[PDB]
Amino acid sequence: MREIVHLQAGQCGNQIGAKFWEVISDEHGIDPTGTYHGDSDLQLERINVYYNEATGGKYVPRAVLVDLEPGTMDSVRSGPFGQIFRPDNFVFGQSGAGNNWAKGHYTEGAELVDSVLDVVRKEAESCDCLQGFQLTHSLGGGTGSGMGTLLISKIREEYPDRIMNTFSVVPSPKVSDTVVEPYNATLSVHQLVENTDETYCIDNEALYDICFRTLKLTTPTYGDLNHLVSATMSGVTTCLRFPGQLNADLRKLAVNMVPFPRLHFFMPGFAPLTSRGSQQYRALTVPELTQQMFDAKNMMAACDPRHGRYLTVAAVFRGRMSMKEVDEQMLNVQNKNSSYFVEWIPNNVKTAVCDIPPRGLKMSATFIGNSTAIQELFKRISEQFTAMFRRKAFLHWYTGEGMDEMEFTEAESNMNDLVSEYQQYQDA
């Protein structure tokens, strides 16, 4: 009745989606064989949000797995849940992007976008009433960043009234995984500004900090990092698939968190994270949820909120809680920290409560926060970009794919204008 079509592009997108679909499957009670083995009727009443009906008590995801070279989806398909995807949803070519945005946007992704658009139309027009879209990708690569933005540009032309979410992974400040990554991040951000309704920015070393300081995991694999992104993905749409005292879907959050259309970059967070020996030292209560939720070492982007002002903050609570406690705590958070909240918005907090918690947990909450402190990631990307573009570092790998030299000038101008627009609301 309100369906979501899920897209994943590139290695980062496919590997995050392989964990996200497993997490949704455990939430709704789906075995690796594809059937349903739930123990409550509430896990079946809203299964059409993410699953398609098939005969024999079997359900299939709405995923469209996209990659330029299928080397990642081969390892995805061999996992414990890799055989539940429909075979026709895998779209692939023979040659990879090679960590090149221009290749994946003009050379290789142009020959592959027709089949992806066909699969998307097939899976989107078979729905009763489409709610929106979800895309997981990265801004440091060439497939998830190059063609992952081409998919948005072609989707928004056809369906210009649907929610377009992007759970992107943004570059880190300390250590780079790609050398040409500032170019890819700049161009993908320039595409993302004018083509998305919400954007959730996730920094890898923020997740490493979470797994090191809060979870005390000596050897966290990339699956452990992807688990947190999956958990913060499934919290945003938990009111579509489960009832609540106070309901809020993607559109309600998009209304409440976006005061101006260009300001839609959010910084996520997942509340009940407890280490392996200290579960007896803390109780699942709303004060001890909101104490961790607003914390700086609990966020998923590497920029503490003390560098700026919160504009709008949301918290989609899950579980059976007294919302008088929720209201009192979210008032106390605003009243105690007067200088870190904007003045011309009387209430900066949007609150949703859903009854059904994650399995094994009494209660949970997913932080989404529109803070002005997102601008320092943008400034880092811009100055790393103009360090290279001043001397034209790697420009021969982009213009040789047919690009124009004013592309990077235009993208840097748009990014700088976005930073200045964020600075406008820093000082009222």
Partner: protein, 47 residues
Amino acid sequence: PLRRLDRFCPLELPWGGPHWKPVSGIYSVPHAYRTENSNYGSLKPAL
């Protein structure tokens, strides 16, 4: 002569793969899978 201690470990995991169905413990949460509207037309609601 060795050729086997390189492709294969001479070891086994001391634990089996942890399954994700401790169903008697998942339902040990207070008011397991019970919504808020079930109190309307019942006896004694508290949380």
